[PDB]
Design a protein around this nucleic acid. Sequence first.
RNA 1: GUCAAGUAAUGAAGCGCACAUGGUGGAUGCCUUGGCAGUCAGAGGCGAUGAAAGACGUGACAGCCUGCGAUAAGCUUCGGGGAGGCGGCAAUAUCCUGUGAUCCGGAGAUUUCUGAAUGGGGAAACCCACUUACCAUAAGGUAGGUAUCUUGUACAAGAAGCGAACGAGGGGAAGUGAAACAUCUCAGUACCCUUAGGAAAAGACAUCAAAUGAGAUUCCCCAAGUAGCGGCGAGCGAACGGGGAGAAGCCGAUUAAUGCUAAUGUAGAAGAACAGCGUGGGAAAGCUGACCGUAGUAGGUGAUAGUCCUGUAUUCGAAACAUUAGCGUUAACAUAUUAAGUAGGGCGGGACACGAGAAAUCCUGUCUGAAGAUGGGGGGACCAUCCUCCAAGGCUAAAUACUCCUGACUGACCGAUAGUGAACCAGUACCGUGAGGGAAAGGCGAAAAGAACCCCUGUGAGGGGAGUGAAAUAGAACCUGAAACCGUGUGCGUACAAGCAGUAGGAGCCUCAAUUUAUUGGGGUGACUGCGUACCUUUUGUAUAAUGGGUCAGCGACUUAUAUUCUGUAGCAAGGUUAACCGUUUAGGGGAGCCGUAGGGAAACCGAGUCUUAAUAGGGCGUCUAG
RNA 2: GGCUCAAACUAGGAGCCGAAGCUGCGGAUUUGAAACUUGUUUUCAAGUGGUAGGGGAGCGUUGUGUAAGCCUGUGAAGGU
RNA 3: CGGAAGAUCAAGGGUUCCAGUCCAACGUUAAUCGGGGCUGGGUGAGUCGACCCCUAAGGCGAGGCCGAAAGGCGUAGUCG
RNA 4: CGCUUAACUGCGAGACCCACAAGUCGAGCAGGUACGAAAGUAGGUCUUAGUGAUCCGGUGGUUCUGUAUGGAAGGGCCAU
Lengths: 144, 116, 149
Amino acid sequence: GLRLNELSPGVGAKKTAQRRGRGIGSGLGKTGGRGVKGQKSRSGSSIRAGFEGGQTPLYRRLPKFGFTSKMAMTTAEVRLSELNKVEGDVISVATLKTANIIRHDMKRARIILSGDVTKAYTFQGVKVTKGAKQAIEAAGGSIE
Amino acid sequence: ARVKRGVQANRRHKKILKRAKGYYGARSRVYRVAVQAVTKAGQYAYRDRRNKKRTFRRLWIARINAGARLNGLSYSRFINGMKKANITIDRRVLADIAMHDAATFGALVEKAKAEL
Amino acid sequence: VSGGGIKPWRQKGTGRARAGSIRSPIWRGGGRAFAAKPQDWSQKVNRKMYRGAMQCILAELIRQERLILVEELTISAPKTKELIAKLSELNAPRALIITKEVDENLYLAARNIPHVNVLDTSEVDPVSLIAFDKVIMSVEAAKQFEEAL
RNA sequence: GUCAAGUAAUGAAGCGCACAUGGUGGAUGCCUUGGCAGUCAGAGGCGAUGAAAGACGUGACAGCCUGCGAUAAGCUUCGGGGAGGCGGCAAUAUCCUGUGAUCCGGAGAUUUCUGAAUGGGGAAACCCACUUACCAUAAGGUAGGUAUCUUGUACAAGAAGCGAACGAGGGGAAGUGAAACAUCUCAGUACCCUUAGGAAAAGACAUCAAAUGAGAUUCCCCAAGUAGCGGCGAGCGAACGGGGAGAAGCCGAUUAAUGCUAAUGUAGAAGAACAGCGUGGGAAAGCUGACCGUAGUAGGUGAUAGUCCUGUAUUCGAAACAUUAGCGUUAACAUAUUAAGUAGGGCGGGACACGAGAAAUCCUGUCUGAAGAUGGGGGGACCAUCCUCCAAGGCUAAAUACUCCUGACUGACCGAUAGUGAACCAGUACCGUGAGGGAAAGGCGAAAAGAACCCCUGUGAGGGGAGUGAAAUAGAACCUGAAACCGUGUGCGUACAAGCAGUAGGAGCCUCAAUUUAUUGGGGUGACUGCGUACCUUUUGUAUAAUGGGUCAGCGACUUAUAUUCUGUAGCAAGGUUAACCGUUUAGGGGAGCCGUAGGGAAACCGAGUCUUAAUAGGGCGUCUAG
RNA sequence: GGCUCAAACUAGGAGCCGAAGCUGCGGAUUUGAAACUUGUUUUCAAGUGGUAGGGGAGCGUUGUGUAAGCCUGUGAAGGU
RNA sequence: CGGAAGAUCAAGGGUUCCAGUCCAACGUUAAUCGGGGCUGGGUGAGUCGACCCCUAAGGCGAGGCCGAAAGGCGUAGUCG
RNA sequence: CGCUUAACUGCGAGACCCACAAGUCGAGCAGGUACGAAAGUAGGUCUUAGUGAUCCGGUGGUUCUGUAUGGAAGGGCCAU
């Protein structure tokens, strides 16, 4: 930089904050944009997520459905375009972990057809979709 | 970073009171009464700035009416005569001629009188 | 604020504005509505943002002829006069000296000169490169910035 | 000149405006002796050898504060230091001091009474005792002993009480939220009570895990606002595991003394370098020229100083007594030997994120009650298999929590309505029976040089001279001195005229500057004319006879922390980014994690598809980039 | 006030007054439009009453760096 | 006035008592005066009262009983 | 009047209505039928009222899940 004087934020970067109740000319005087007497104009007012003023809220007129599966939280889906972060040629679950592609607590992984591979890989213990399988072996890869 | 407002408030209040000089009683001494006297004075001035143009035309027309009636016709027939003679002289100038040079206004009425 | 727990007077009847505490923010000696507390002011600069800024500053320093490359800047004795004289022949009476392994007697030589500071390349900050009028970087220290940026 | 008619001017009891000049008042500005928040270290107690808090005394000197205790602003000794001193308001007097004072540090001696108060009592600072020894002979003195409880052999050793927060433990609300309210929340919070240590607690697997297994406890970042719990409401809310800090395991890792060794701490010492000239009350600021620098942004000094002073960088001293660590010794306590009224069970409760729920696990008031290594606990109902580990004995450092405090240092913290309630003789005055509540109040000047003397007055207040001072509308109610508010003077207007008091015009008068001399321009006033029912709030609608404001000055209300969403901008970009931590600390490292890159379905599962379906039909949701 | 062949009423006619409407003259401003092109410039067109409220651009005050700078006893802040 | 508005106390207060001196503030005015300021003085007990001995109501209460803790009660006593 | 079970199952292009949650009409396609000789008609009744979300609990089914593993409990989905 030139000097600590001529260092400017690059117009558009900074915006002046809004101050409520500082006179007529500021556009926020006497109310802060709160309107007139009402619950939402009061000091501790809030919108209260999940409230329609008394009729049973939408999340309670509809039924609960489904159950959470523990398997789904340890099965990670792997994309073909993410494989460039792998060191070497083997693609395994432990190899996907050291590449930071999947979480360290993931038990199993699935390779789907999202991008495209650039080198031959060897998949041992990971399930590969039909579209991804033909893209793998089109680049010289294999699945075992 | 505590900010003390005494200095800015003093010259702010002083600015309003300086604008309220000559007002009677509290209107030129205490800020609370002087601030709304200064605002009211500005409102009167804005409206009286339109009314001034409105009031001097009444003055010119009355002066012209007196001048035309001194020698011949009335204002209503005078303005018609000037309009038919394609005379563009404004009522401001006419009222000045009537009040300050009666010979010219006498000649000016004749041109309007011969046109009707 | 100390005290101010009881209602100063009954709500109705006295003819005064209702009050709940003598330590109200409306009262003299009352509490601060939105009283300040200790807070952290450190921001996050992205690693590449800090690296990019130092690259931009050093590049700009060269463009305005404020960088001075020297082979080495060492002082035989921890003497302020010796370094003051060496800066004069370097045409930088007030400058920021950047060297690798800042000497234990070069530190003492510059520790008294008013607008002069000697820093290791690993303890150079973006403000120091801008504040000082000139920067005397050794060739060895310039290579460190070449690798670290 | 006389009369008649018409029509000017002149007035001010008072008042208005402007200006000038004061008073009151104490804003503002500048200032600080005082506070506020922290960082890095240390310490974490005091007390029956009488504490914390007090009462009363104590001086040459009347009071208060500070110190001290009848040896009473103090006594002795050991060190430091070297010329003044007998604490402050706050001076005066007698004096002390190189025969080393005052002053500072270590140790000691003295240490009234009350108070755990402890010889009994009691309305605290008081009353009344008994007893041993000695002395005196009178109606006493000196030195002790005499509380209660607990542990040892009627004898010794302890305890008591007070005082910040942090810990552990025994009890335990309600306001509130749920837009009501009872389950629930608030919350195991506030509060009460017991008790410890510098920390406490916990701690070594009858623990997890289910992978290729790991390997105590504690704390931080993630996991994750996920899984769950829940009038499935409001809300509550993990764990596994990963990344770090710290790591330790034992069978006494106890406590208290003593002596050596080492290092601190509690007083200190030295510590560089500037002159001239001009202005000025005063020089540090100006001009010219020097010097030191391991010392240049310190505080002062008559205005702003590296070279005037105190200081700073740097180098160092301890007779004495604490403190920390290492070694040795001494005496108090402790030293299990593998664990039965135990695990488990019934009933009622409590804790687990988990509200009985399909409810595992832990705790236990009641009633019961094993097996005991060919055995037993757990793996979230339960059974089988497998894995893991051995309860019913006791310990264990660090990483963690905190501040009554001690030191060093810091602040986009305050600057006298602020900051502590308290900058000042403040927990005071004052209020209250009491618990308790709780103020106000800073500034002469550089130096008191604080005004000798004279004059008016009552030997008063107050002032005027004189004098001091740069300044005295800096004169002690003292820096600056605002406004409200109250006077005095000058100019103009105003006693026939009806109202938010102004505004647009406008005659006259007064006053300054030019100008060849009433012509303009500036200022003050405002006869007369037109128009014109304050402001705020709240309302369909207010001059409203609806609200609020006596005025002035000062203060007074959209914040902060975190999460999340959108927008802008910047860096990188199919990638972006680290968190805690480490770090010689805004760097660098740390990739755990998070978001993006794929969706469909309750899910298994499949995947540019997927779900529904008998269906390949139809249809739903997706698809054909920017984060 | 006053008004009676009106200064009333009916039916016509011609003048004129009359608003912040329109036009004239000067100036500002929002949006869009041809370009030395970011207000670099000349214009043109349509706009510019406003509560709740949304959007945009700024002023001043205290403090930090810039600043061991600059100003200041030949007079700072504050006051008037 | 004089069954007090005169005297002696208790309670409560605490120097207001006496003298000299001063008049700013205090005294609802003035003040030379004062319960005001300042400076001195003044309260003498075997017999008056307290203290002391004794006890009432009522407290506290070695041991004792009861109670999550804190504590509640209670005998001998010890205060009152 | 005879025969019957379309008072079906999976859906449904497209619309009406509508803040949402809901509600209404619907040709056509596949499967299995009922009646008719057949083209065909039939997803209740001439239509518009005859109704009540979620939670929770029950019942009939279902490979979906199944806290070390195999089960099971519990849960999910479809129907009521």
